[PDB]
Ligand binder design. Structure first.
Ligand SMILES: O=c1c(O)c(-c2ccc(O)c(O)c2)oc2cc(O)c(O)c(O)c12
Length: 274
């Protein structure tokens, strides 16, 4: 019943999400990640089913924790005078999609298809559980390099899912949709599909398509790499300017470009030198 049940390792990263460390649970040498969030710096707070104030990330992680390996699982959490400490699972070996794309450039379509499909399955899982991520992007995706499995992380900018309009947003601007930029209003699903469009382009071209607000609003997509027409079609669909013109998750998964996806294990054998 303390913090010394884990042997703390090196710092993995720090940013708007706080500070995350590599760790090992001494109880059984299980690889873990240890995230510390200062209370002053917490955006949105939630409340646990049993009445007690916690960071929204904790509520959301509990709602999605299950057998599904598509989302990083919350093993435990603690409260401190001025911070919260989350204990999360940690694949080993691992690499985040942002670094993987920095090192390999534009990913081959077969690989981007496997990864994109897995992201789709995970976002669907979150939505079934009543959770909206709101910061889907390469830096918030981990690759279990041995099994070829992607895991979604960092629900700190997330919210309970609803059908009404959202007037707040604290995720990544360049992954944010035109309707946010222009009116500070979005619906959850359509906004998610837009970020998924940004993420697919990122995967197949090696960089995000838009850097400035004027480009997001204009919505014209230029391809800087060789990309098949089907893939270009799916990306442009996801990046439709009107929210209602974007595809649903079902429409994305039944799109011609998404057929014959490789299983994660096959994916690691062919593309991850596993
Ligand atoms: O295992 C994790 C993990 O759970 C997380 C994680 C999990 C939940 C969060 O909210 C979050 O911000 C990060 O992050 C990282 C980041 C790394 O660079 C790495 O090598 C890792 O192994 C991990």
């Amino acid at each position: 019943p303390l913090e010394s049940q884990y042997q703390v390792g090196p710092l993995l990263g720090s940013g708007g999400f706080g500070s995350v460390y590599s760790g090992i649970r001494v109880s059984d040498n299980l690889p873990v990640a240890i995230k510390h969030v200062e209370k002053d710096r917490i955006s949105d707070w939630g409340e646990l089913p049993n009445g007690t104030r916690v960071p929204m990330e904790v509520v959301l992680l509990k709602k999605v924790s299950s057998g599904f390996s598509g989302v990083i699982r919350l093993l435990d959490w603690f409260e401190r005078p001025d911070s919260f400490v989350l204990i999360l699972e940690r694949p080993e070996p691992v690499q985040d999609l942002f670094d993987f794309i920095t090192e390999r450039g534009a990913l081959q379509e077969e690989l981007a298809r496997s990864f994109f499909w897995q992201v789709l399955e995970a976002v669907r899982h979150c939505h079934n559980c009543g959770v909206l991520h709101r910061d889907i992007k390469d830096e918030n995706i981990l690759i279990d390099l041995n099994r070829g499995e992607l895991k979604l992380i960092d629900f700190g900018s997330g919210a309970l899912l609803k059908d009404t309009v959202y007037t707040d947003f604290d995720g990544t601007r360049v992954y944010s949709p035109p309707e946010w930029i222009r009116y500070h209003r979005y619906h959850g699903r359509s906004a998610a599909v837009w970020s998924l469009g940004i993420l697919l382009y990122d995967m197949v071209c090696g960089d995000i398509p838009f850097e400035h607000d004027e480009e997001i609003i204009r919505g014209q997509v230029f391809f800087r790499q060789r990309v098949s027409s089907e893939c270009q079609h799916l990306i442009r669909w996801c990046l439709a300017l009107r929210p209602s013109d974007r595809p649903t998750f079902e429409e994305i998964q039944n799109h011609p470009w998404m057929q014959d996806v490789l299983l994660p294990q096959e994916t690691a054998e062919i593309h991850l030198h596993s």
